[PDB]
Every structure is written in structure tokens, then in C-alpha cells.
Subunit: 127 residues, 2 copies
């Protein structure tokens, strides 16, 4: 019901920008299309889409979570612009193997890793 | 004044545990030693120590920031137990080079990266 309707709305919203966006930003984009969705709802939907692997999530330097619906389904990571949120989907096979061997070696189970590269793209570099 | 006294208190608190701790946990350890420090203060100090590179910081799966004063000054990363917070200081030269080449290649400047491995240590694995 209001669950799948709103989920599609939020997902469709993400598909309109190539940049990572905070939940408040997404909420605003929806509010601009005349959507009656609340911020809390937007936040829950996004966190739900994140867990289902339908959108990627990452933290900004100031601790804020930002989201993005990415092109591939492949396991990947990102190089993000901390200024505009622009991002590049990146894969590092050697990082993957290193991350597995490190865990495997210290007897850790249910391994998960977070790898993200932050920088300032040329466009933003000239502010 | 109350700045350096509290900074040492919080830093000394971190040196008492080998595990990553949330700010609330640290505040409680301090409250147990009879310290009159508030949570907000504890949080600010930790964020200040983090920026100065005096303590490492990382986010847990539920978005909570946790801290740790690590053995080396060397640039390193961690394999953390999401259950107890136990951690291993790890270095990955190939990851470092990959992270530089990726940024250098897409014209990004002021590069920074975050790399952390999450798992469940044997001890916690048996709960
Ligand atoms: Zn992605
Ligand atoms: Zn940018
Ligand atoms: Zn460390
Ligand atoms: Zn553990």
C-alpha cells in the first residue's frame, strides 16, 4: 500500500540525480513534485532500500548519510566528491582479496567491509 | 583549563580499553571514576582528538560512531568486531596505491579514504 507507492516514489527520485543525496535533500525533491511524504518516512524507505541493496549508502565527513542508486548490481565502491556528491563506481579486486584474507586470517566470520574514496572534483575545486 | 584537563581524562579513558567505544560508553567509564564531565563535552573532546589524529574513529552498522586510541602513529585501518568492538590495526599497501591512482585518475584533489573491515570475532561468534 502506502509502502510500495512511497518506495517507488523515493526510488524514482534517486534515479533523477547522478549524485549522492542526503535524506533531507531527497525529501525536498519529493516535496517539489507535490509528494505528501514525511521526512521520517523518506528516511525509513531509504534505509530499507539500502538493506535490500537497491541503493548504496555512505557517510559524509560531517557524519551525514547520503544515498545513491548506482548503475551496476556488481559489488562496487565509490570515489565521491565531498563538495557536490558526484561519484564514480569503482572496483578493486586486490582490495577485495586483501579484505578477505585479513578477516579469514584473524578468525572473523560474517565479514563485511566499507571502502570509499573522498575527494574534490575539478568542478568543485574551482569555487 | 577545563579543556586540557578533560582532554587528558578522555584520552586516559581510551587508553584503558583495547576496544572501540561509543561516546556514551566512554562517558560512563568516566562517570564511574567520579568525573563530572557531561556527555556533550565527552563527545566534543573525542571529535577534537579524532581530527588531531589522536584517536581513530569509525561507524558501526547502526550508524553509531565509536572510538579508539591505537598503538601506531602509522597510517592504518582496522578489522573490527561488530559484537565486542575488538580491533586489529591493519595496513594494506596495495589498497593505498589503488586509492591514490583512482583519485589521481579522475582528477580529484585533497583525497581521503575510509577503509574498515567488519566481522565477528570467535569469542563473540559463540553467544
Ligand atoms: Zn554504488
Ligand atoms: Zn564536485
Ligand atoms: Zn586505528
Ligand atoms: Zn568480539
Amino acid at each position: 500500500g502506502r509502502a510500495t507507492r512511497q518506495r517507488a516514489a523515493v526510488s524514482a527520485a534517486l534515479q533523477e540525480v547522478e549524485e549522492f543525496r542526503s535524506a533531507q535533500e531527497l525529501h525536498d525533491m519529493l516535496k517539489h513534485k507535490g509528494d505528501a511524504v514525511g521526512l521520517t518516512t523518506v528516511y525509513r524507505t531509504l534505509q530499507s532500500l539500502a538493506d535490500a541493496g537497491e541503493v548504496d549508502v555512505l557517510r559524509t565527513a560531517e557524519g551525514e548519510s547520503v544515498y545513491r542508486r548506482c548503475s551496476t548490481g556488481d559489488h562496487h565502491h565509490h570515489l565521491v566528491c565531498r563538495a557536490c556528491g558526484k561519484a564514480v563506481e569503482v572496483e578493486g579486486p586486490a582490495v577485495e582479496k586483501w579484505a578477505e584474507a585479513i578477516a579469514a586470517e584473524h578468525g572473523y566470520v560474517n565479514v563485511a567491509h566499507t571502502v570509499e574514496i573522498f575527494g574534490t572534483c575539478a568542478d568543485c575545486a574551482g569555487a
